[PDB]
Ligand binder design. Sequence first.
Ligand code: HEM
Ligand code: CN5
Lengths: 55, 431
Amino acid sequence: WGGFSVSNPTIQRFFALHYLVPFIIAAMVIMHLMALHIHGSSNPLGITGNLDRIP
Amino acid sequence: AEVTQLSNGIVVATEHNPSAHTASVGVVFGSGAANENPYNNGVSNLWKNIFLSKENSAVAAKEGLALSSNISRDFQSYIVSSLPGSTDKSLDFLNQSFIQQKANLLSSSNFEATKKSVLKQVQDFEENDHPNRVLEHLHSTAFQNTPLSLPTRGTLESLENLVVADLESFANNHFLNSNAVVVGTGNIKHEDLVNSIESKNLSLQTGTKPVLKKKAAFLGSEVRLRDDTLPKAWISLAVEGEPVNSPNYFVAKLAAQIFGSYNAFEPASRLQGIKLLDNIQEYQLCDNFNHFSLSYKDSGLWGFSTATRNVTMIDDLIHFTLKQWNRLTISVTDTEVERAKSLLKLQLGQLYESGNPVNDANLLGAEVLIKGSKLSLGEAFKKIDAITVKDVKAWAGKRLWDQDIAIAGTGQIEGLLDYMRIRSDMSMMRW
Ligand code: HEM
Ligand SMILES: CCCCCCCCCCCCCCC(=O)OCCCOP(=O)(O)OC[C@@H](O)COP(=O)(O)OCCCOC(C)=O
């Protein structure tokens, strides 16, 4: 809170936290795509897809 | 040279050469694999091997005679060769094999041994000869459900169900005087051949062969025969091209000479003035390629064939080759057009002025059967020398720019991408 209740320090710091965290999400998305590239996506049959691939 | 045609009921063509030490005499028919149906596919290939069987060839070798034959899509041929002072015996042998007595050849023992010999040729062809069987599959998907799709040797499934009656039916309908040309090449005079035929009153059969319902139609398509046990990838690719008796016949032939043929292991073939070779040689994308322009009675094909061991860079080879084809519509230099004029004349001179009278008999008969006469080589050179840069761009913008394609492949072709990634490379559109 920055004090003894939800007050002016609370609202000024919540806005500055709020601008930052969207840019941390954008870096977790890059790490998320990197982990998908090494094995690729699955398919609704649940078997291997290396026999039939299209770009 | 100079040709001479006549018609005394029988069409006789001749091309004398006083420098030759041999003479060839034969008959060429105007029917081939494109005049068959899927049930009797291969019946023309059996007539070839019945003519070249051992008991027939033994009768020829006792008089000093050699036999040959050739089966193609639009015609068939049966040639006899001899010394120059023995051409009268050549005609008698041909008399007792087609005009008379082609029943001694179709005996039971001679037909079973011949059949077994042909089933073994077509089996070894489909398992060992990869460049030629991929080009056969190209004709089979590009012209599917039309007469121009059938293979010239036949298939193993249609050959097994052929009996003697299928051979006799095909002869009554196609081996006709209306569909035949008698040819002569080498050291043989034109008047000595016709007087020898008049002294015998020959007549094969009268005429009116069948009608042939459907025309040839090009369809954009692909066929893939994947085999991961083989060590290369063999690919062929083409568009629709020019038939014979087309005005753009020699312009299509000249545009194929611009890109030409390649062998990576010959040192002088790496130095040709072809801009495509600056892209291929950096990473060695292929072992060889060759560009073709094929022409038939009803349609044609224009494209290239390749073989490679770089099975991970196939998409870069197909891409770079199709970007050079685009330049024929946009940006093609006057230097590239003058190089291709000179080499095309050398290519046509070797084909038509070889030493073999047997090759000249096949070219003469096919041409006279399909346009009535034969064009001289001096007249063909003048047409080639009158082709401009504007003529190539007009031909390419009609036949190449944003047009459908036919594809065939075999071997390690996992890296060959889908149809539409390749279809899209036929138009630049960065333009
Ligand atoms: C900003 C949020 C996210 C983005 C931009 C994102 C992006 C992607 C993309 C582009 C793919 C590949 C295409 C697809 O499968 O639809 C994918 C796959 C996947 N995502 Fe996400 N994702 C996000 C959040 C999540 C969350 C919250 C989860 C799970 C808690 C998750 C789990 C997965 C999994 C398991 C796959 C693989 C599915 C498969 O291949 O069958 N992702 N993600
Ligand atoms: C201290 C350690 C690190 C130092 C330097 C590391 C450099 C990071 C990559 C260098 C290596 C590249 C070669 C391939 C490899 O092994 O690394 C994979 C690279 C990361 O791939 P990605 O960017 O997640 O692709 C993900 C793809 O979607 C392409 O990415 P895209 O969505 O275009 O991203 C832009 C969006 C936001 O990017 C910003 C703003 O940063």
